[PDB]
Amino acid sequence: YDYDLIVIGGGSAGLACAKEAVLNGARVACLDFVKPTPTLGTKWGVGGTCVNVGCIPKKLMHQASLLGEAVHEAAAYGWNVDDKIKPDWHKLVQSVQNHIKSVNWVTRVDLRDKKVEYINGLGSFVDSHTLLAKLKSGERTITAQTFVIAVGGRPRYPDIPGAVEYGITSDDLFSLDREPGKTLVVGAGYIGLECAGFLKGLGYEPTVMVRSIVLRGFDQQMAELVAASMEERGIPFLRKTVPLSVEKQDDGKLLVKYKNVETGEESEDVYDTVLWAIGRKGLVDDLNLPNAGVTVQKDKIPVDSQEATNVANIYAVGDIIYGKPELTPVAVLAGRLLARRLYGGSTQRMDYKDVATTVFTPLEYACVGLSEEDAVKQFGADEIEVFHGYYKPTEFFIPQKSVRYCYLKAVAERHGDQRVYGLHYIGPVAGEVIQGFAAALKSGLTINTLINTVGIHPTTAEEFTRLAITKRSGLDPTPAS
Amino acid sequence: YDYDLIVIGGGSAGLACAKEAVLNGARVACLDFVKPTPTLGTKWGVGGTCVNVGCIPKKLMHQASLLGEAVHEAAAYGWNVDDKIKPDWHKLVQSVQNHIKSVNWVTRVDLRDKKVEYINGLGSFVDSHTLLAKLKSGERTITAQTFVIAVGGRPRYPDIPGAVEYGITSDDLFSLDREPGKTLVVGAGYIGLECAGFLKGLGYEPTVMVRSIVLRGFDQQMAELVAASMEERGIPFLRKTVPLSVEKQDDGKLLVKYKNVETGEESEDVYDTVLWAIGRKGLVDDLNLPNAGVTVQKDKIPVDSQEATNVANIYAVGDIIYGKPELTPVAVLAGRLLARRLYGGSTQRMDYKDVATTVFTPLEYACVGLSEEDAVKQFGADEIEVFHGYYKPTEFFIPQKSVRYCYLKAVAERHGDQRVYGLHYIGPVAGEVIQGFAAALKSGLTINTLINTVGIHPTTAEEFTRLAITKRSGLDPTPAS
Ligand SMILES: Cc1cc2nc3c(=O)[nH]c(=O)nc-3n(C[C@H](O)[C@H](O)[C@H](O)COP(=O)(O)OP(=O)(O)OC[C@H]3O[C@@H](n4cnc5c(N)ncnc54)[C@H](O)[C@@H]3O)c2cc1C
Ligand SMILES: Cc1cc2nc3c(=O)[nH]c(=O)nc-3n(C[C@H](O)[C@H](O)[C@H](O)COP(=O)(O)OP(=O)(O)OC[C@H]3O[C@@H](n4cnc5c(N)ncnc54)[C@H](O)[C@@H]3O)c2cc1C
Numbered sequence: 001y002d003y004d005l006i007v008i009g010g011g012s013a014g015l016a017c018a019k020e021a022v023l024n025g026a027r028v029a030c031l032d033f034v035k036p037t038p039t040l041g042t043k044w045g046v047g048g049t050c051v052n053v054g055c056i057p058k059k060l061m062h063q064a065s066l067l068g069e070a071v072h073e074a075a076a077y078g079w080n081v082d083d084k085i086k087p088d089w090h091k092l093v094q095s096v097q098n099h100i101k102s103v104n105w106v107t108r109v110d111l112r113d114k115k116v117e118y119i120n121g122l123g124s125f126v127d128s129h130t131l132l133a134k135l136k137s138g139e140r141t142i143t144a145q146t147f148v149i150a151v152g153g154r155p156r157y158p159d160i161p162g163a164v165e166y167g168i169t170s171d172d173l174f175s176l177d178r179e180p181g182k183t184l185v186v187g188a189g190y191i192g193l194e195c196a197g198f199l200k201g202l203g204y205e206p207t208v209m210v211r212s213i214v215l216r217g218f219d220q221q222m223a224e225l226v227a228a229s230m231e232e233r234g235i236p237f238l239r240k241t242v243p244l245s246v247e248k249q250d251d252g253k254l255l256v257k258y259k260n261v262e263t264g265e266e267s268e269d270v271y272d273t274v275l276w277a278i279g280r281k282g283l284v285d286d287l288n289l290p291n292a293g294v295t296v297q298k299d300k301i302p303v304d305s306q307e308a309t310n311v312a313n314i315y316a317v318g319d320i321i322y323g324k325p326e327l328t329p330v331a332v333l334a335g336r337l338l339a340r341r342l343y344g345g346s347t348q349r350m351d352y353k354d355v356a357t358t359v360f361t362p363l364e365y366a367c368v369g370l371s372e373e374d375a376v377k378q379f380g381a382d383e384i385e386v387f388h389g390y391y392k393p394t395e396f397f398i399p400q401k402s403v404r405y406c407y408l409k410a411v412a413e414r415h416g417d418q419r420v421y422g423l424h425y426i427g428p429v430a431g432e433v434i435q436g437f438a439a440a441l442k443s444g445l446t447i448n449t450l451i452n453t454v455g456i457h458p459t460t461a462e463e464f465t466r467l468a469i470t471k472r473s474g475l476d477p478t479p480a481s
Numbered sequence: 482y483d484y485d486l487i488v489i490g491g492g493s494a495g496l497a498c499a500k501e502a503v504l505n506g507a508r509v510a511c512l513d514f515v516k517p518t519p520t521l522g523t524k525w526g527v528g529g530t531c532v533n534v535g536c537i538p539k540k541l542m543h544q545a546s547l548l549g550e551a552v553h554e555a556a557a558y559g560w561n562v563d564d565k566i567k568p569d570w571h572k573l574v575q576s577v578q579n580h581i582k583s584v585n586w587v588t589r590v591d592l593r594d595k596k597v598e599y600i601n602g603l604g605s606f607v608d609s610h611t612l613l614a615k616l617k618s619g620e621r622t623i624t625a626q627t628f629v630i631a632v633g634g635r636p637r638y639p640d641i642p643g644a645v646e647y648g649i650t651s652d653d654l655f656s657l658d659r660e661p662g663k664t665l666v667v668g669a670g671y672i673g674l675e676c677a678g679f680l681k682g683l684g685y686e687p688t689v690m691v692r693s694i695v696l697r698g699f700d701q702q703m704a705e706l707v708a709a710s711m712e713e714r715g716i717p718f719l720r721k722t723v724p725l726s727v728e729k730q731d732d733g734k735l736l737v738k739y740k741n742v743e744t745g746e747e748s749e750d751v752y753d754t755v756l757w758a759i760g761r762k763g764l765v766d767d768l769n770l771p772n773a774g775v776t777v778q779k780d781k782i783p784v785d786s787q788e789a790t791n792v793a794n795i796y797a798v799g800d801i802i803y804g805k806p807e808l809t810p811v812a813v814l815a816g817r818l819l820a821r822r823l824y825g826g827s828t829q830r831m832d833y834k835d836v837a838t839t840v841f842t843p844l845e846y847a848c849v850g851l852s853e854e855d856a857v858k859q860f861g862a863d864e865i866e867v868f869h870g871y872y873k874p875t876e877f878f879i880p881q882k883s884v885r886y887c888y889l890k891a892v893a894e895r896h897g898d899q900r901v902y903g904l905h906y907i908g909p910v911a912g913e914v915i916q917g918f919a920a921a922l923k924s925g926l927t928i929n930t931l932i933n934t935v936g937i938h939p940t941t942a943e944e945f946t947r948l949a950i951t952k953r954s955g956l957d958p959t960p961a962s
Pocket of ligand 2: 456457458489490491492493494495512513514515516528529530531534535536537539602603604605631632633634651672764767768798799800801807808809810812
């Protein structure tokens, strides 16, 4: 039709796909709309979830929290720093949002310059080749040759009285007018863990509420070490607990009634803020996919190895895609690769294996490859070797920081090549450490090259090259301390 | 004789060799003596150069300097931090030395526990199987079956009036009674660069004096970016300059006369402290090597691929070894491997290739593999590809930190497998970033796996996986900023 390609959604995948497609000669349009959060009505510019309400504000709040610790440690080194320091939440919000808005503008200019037609409207299918764009002016537009769906998701709400009325989600949190105060974080995935982490670091009082387990999908030894790490720093956890309701009392305070799911313990407590970090739901609803005859696997769209949907002419990429890693660089690269196969004469497909990730908890946890339990399930316990250790960061000594949760692990093939299957690290700058190892795994990293890679001294990254104690041995993982 | 193995020198290599040899059934002795610095008479416990006067105190001073910046940045994030903070040099020295002495004691206990006979004496050869140990009591002892020389070196002094009298070296610096004040750092190797770096960061006024070039042996594009980095932060450099003398004037101040070597410009300036970081000289002198018939290559001992000297029964390892990387983990691992070949029935030799290193300058520089110029010299310019980029750390935005010297580069084979030859990074936590890539290089890292390794977002480590602009292209290395 009017376009070679229409891209539905202007986030990490959408924009990456749109820009790449134009680079290879295509006439392309990209639609992006941001539906305002129910209650509070929070809204943001173009660029998607990461820039506006995801990786970026998250990392900036984490850094702000990290810098407070740095202030407290500086005194141990001889700096005449004052003990009683406090962050200004409105000042922090201000700085964070200033950076985001600057990025928004640059993104818009970059899109125009690269000749990507950005439409600030909500797209819905009329037909496998025809889309209704709904602009601000209530105006509409139609038609294109190929389609890329990169619509992502939005924070879920519990089906519980008071939830959408009194509670907030990550969407709201990063520009919050009100000071968080005492806050209940419902959800022990990374978003809930990270938020609780930096809320404590900035002088507030979070509680994490767990339905079942901490960080589902992650190595559970590591997930429990991160949780215990957080309790060490004064973050309490409510185990096996589900919320029942929240109500605004004539007080300004928020009463939350909750329930143990193993026991039947009905209990309650009062908070200034309630954060629902209970997962995200794909925005398939507003697309009218049946009009295009595209099949859905419940809030998500199943795609083949080429990101094609059951309709040859229509594709999906990023978060709406069923059961693939939901991260920004995954989305960016899959979108770019896609645009390059459609218009660049490329045959390179996306590689969704051994994607590294970092949980930016107070003590960060990075990993890549298999968890211990998945490797044991997949190959058998007696064909698996785990090398592990507790270690001591050079910079933790003078300030006498806890090394209790500074733990490192390599999950590997036991015999033969001794191929590394997974690497797990809790500690300082965990994503900075794991990134290069994720590349090493991708080049076929074995235990032998790992262990004969010379260390960079003094660093915490060199701890991986120092691994020598196996779990099978039963020897102390704390080595001549 | 009396021992299976005598180890001469109780540093990184010596201790690693001694401990490993006992693990494999050997009767071993290890000698260590620390000659006090001329003037000031500085002395330290067992464990060698790194623990006492090297990597460790260096990293701790660097961290102390880093933590001051963190204090200054915290205000941008909303922390009510006070601007006028100052470190206490004696308090910093105190903390650093407390940690070192604690490590000294633990090291002594560990050696006794592992049954390594530590002799606090100076060893010199009488014979290829016989050593004179000289203890504190003026006492002596003799005799053994095999020998490991791991004696390292000590800071060099210029052959110039006033040098040993008024100037200091890294040996003195880390426990300095007097406050450094305005200090002249002669030497632009890493030790001089690192010291100048943390002296500025802790409120003093260093100058770096360069005889010829900055960081000889390192990639010179990178070496100039680090130097310019330091000037940005207010560290001046005296280019093509050699010192002529230093004299104590009735003033307490130190007058240094110097000279341009390209021009003939005789000039002078007054400093509180003068630091000679002009290299280190191997302690071969005190060994009486001719008595054992061991050949020397001028202050260093040449060894074969098995660390054997021209005398079958005698070995050398660590810093005294001719023309190998002079770093702690190199020394530790070569010493361990050696002990394992002598007593463990191992055939594993040391791998001295692709050893990663970090220069802990204010903005750190890590690298591993070939410099750009060595790769071009070795393979030809047209068989070389350089991928490069300037990047922007997420945490630099709010405090509005300079990104001018945040630069990244991958030196690679141009065609075929596109094997990576070298990786270079200036920026935050450079050793934490490079370590895993050093392992990746060792597993055969190519450009294709590098560039299709998914990034961890947001990090500075992910910048390597984002490399896409080549120098050959001539395109702007600052990509849609
Ligand atoms: C708080 C939080 C922290 C995170 N931290 C990290 C992290 O640190 N590292 C990391 O890698 N990832 C992180 N993520 C995940 C990351 O944000 C996502 O994986 C990524 O943004 C997904 O990109 P996308 O293009 O598929 O979707 P999105 O970025 O969400 O973009 C989709 C866009 O399309 C719009 N849209 C939807 N429907 C329509 C329609 N019908 N018409 C027009 N526009 C439409 C949406 O409103 C949205 O603007 C985080 C996410 C959250 C929420
Ligand atoms: C200031 C500075 C910073 C550094 N920073 C780093 C860095 O961050 N990372 C890194 O990897 N490396 C660093 N190094 C290098 C590192 O310290 C050395 O590579 C390492 O210590 C060498 O180990 P070695 O066992 O060969 O010698 P040493 O550690 O010096 O040990 C030799 C010991 O033997 C003693 N000895 C000498 N002769 C005799 C004798 N005749 N009898 C008995 N004992 C004797 C010596 O006095 C000494 O105690 C740094 C060095 C300096 C000086």
